[PDB]
Design a protein around this ligand. Structure first.
Ligand code: NAP
Ligand code: 1WX
Ligand code: 1WX
Length: 316
């Protein structure tokens, strides 16, 4: 049902995908089955979500029942930064691929640019809650990830939560084999990412917008925090099209050629979230939405600026 954004590899990445962070076991399998039924072909996964085994089961079912073919699915996962040491990249990946019950991933991403203390404690922190770093860097990880592409286990690599400085650091690495095909970052009307999107596109890098609905269920949300779904100015535009706020928030990215990955385990909403190809936001509506930028991050809670390669303090 989705249109696509063409990658530099010429592969076609479906422009709407299904997010899976915080999708509980017992619900994420049904969420994936409903999404594939509703036309979704892009599923966004990660090691750290600890639910890939259930996503894998759902994907397998639907393949078994002729609902869809593997080659028409676009499956993305992410390498967590406790596994940046070369040998751990492979092991972490093997776990992700075994859990997803697949023979290859369409895209494998660096989840976050800063290396953490290596190993299977996923959230190494000091007594205050500050991240504990490791010596292996995202360039060390990328080296190991490039092997996976050589071997055909992964069709393309990308990054997530990179600023243009980290992308430059990657693109400018001498001896680079594969370039990233996408940069997955938070993006919505309160964080429009104009300069970052401009930069990525100019380098042949697509952008995938995460938390496009402002992630209203994030555990750290405070009642005073901005709420996109309840924003009267967003709802105004949705009303004009007899659509929902969520549909507007999703359509916003599609019209910027930015891939978008809203999360839901609610069947009605999973369906709602992909009914975004039967309307168009006007230029005036797009301009108004863009004007809502307040450089605001729903995902900005973690304490890690004390380590090298912190992405969020640069201008873009
Ligand atoms: N790379 C990264 O660092 C990173 C960071 C954050 C997220 N992500 C990815 O991006 C995905 C999406 O971001 P997100 O999960 O933070 O938040 P989000 O997609 O902006 O919002 C998800 C929340 O909105 C609800 N929802 C979904 N559709 C709705 C609708 N039509 N109307 C009202 N509410 C709706 C969902 O509820 P129900 O599920 O209960 O329906 C869920 O509580 C994640 O799942 C993950 O795959 C990546
Ligand atoms: O994980 C949970 O169930 C709840 O965890 C929290 C709840 C609150 Cl209110 C604040 C912070 C956390 C937290 O730091 N979690 C570890 C944690 C991350 F650090 C991270 F970056 C990713 Br991505 C994760 F997936 C992940 F789980
Ligand atoms: O990744 C997802 O899909 C969900 O994201 C989260 C979930 C939880 Cl429980 C806690 C934090 C996040 C989150 O902030 N993630 C982006 C992210 C990191 F991953 C990270 F390691 C550092 Br450090 C960051 F500062 C940060 F911004």
């Amino acid at each position: 049902m989705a249109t696509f954004v063409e990658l530099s590899t010429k592969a076609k990445m479906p422009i709407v995908g299904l997010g899976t962070w915080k999708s509980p076991l017992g619900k994420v399998k049904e969420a994936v089955k409903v999404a594939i039924d509703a036309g979704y072909r892009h599923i966004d996964c990660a090691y750290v979500y600890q639910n890939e085994h259930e996503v894998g089961e759902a994907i397998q079912e639907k393949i078994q029942e002729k609902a869809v073919k593997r080659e028409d699915l676009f499956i993305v996962s992410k390498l967590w930064p406790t596994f940046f040491e070369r040998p751990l990249v492979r092991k972490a990946f093997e776990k992700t691929l075994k859990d997803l019950k697949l023979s290859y991933l369409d895209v494998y991403l660096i989840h976050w640019p800063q290396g953490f203390k290596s190993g299977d404690d996923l959230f190494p922190r000091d007594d205050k809650g500050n991240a504990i770093g490791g010596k292996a860097t995202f360039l060390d990880a990328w080296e190991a990830m490039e092997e996976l592409v050589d071997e055909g286990l992964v069709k393309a690599l990308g990054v997530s939560n990179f600023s243009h400085f980290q992308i430059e650091k990657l693109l400018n690495k001498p001896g680079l084999k594969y370039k990233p095909v996408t940069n997955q970052v938070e993006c919505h009307p309160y964080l429009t990412q104009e300069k970052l999107i401009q930069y990525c596109h100019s380098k042949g890098i697509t952008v995938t917008a995460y938390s496009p609905l402002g992630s209203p269920d994030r555990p750290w949300a405070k009642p005073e925090d901005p709420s996109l779904l309840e924003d009267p100015k967003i709802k105004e535009i949705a009303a004009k099209h007899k659509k929902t706020a969520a549909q507007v928030l999703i359509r916003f990215h599609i019209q910027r050629n930015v891939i978008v990955i809203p999360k839901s385990v609610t069947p009605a909403r999973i369906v709602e979230n992909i009914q975004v190809f039967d309307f168009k936001l006007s230029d005036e509506e797009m301009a108004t939405i863009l004007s809502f930028n307040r450089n605001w991050r729903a995902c900005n809670l973690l304490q890690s600026s004390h380590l090298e390669d912190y992405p969020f303090n640069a201008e873009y």
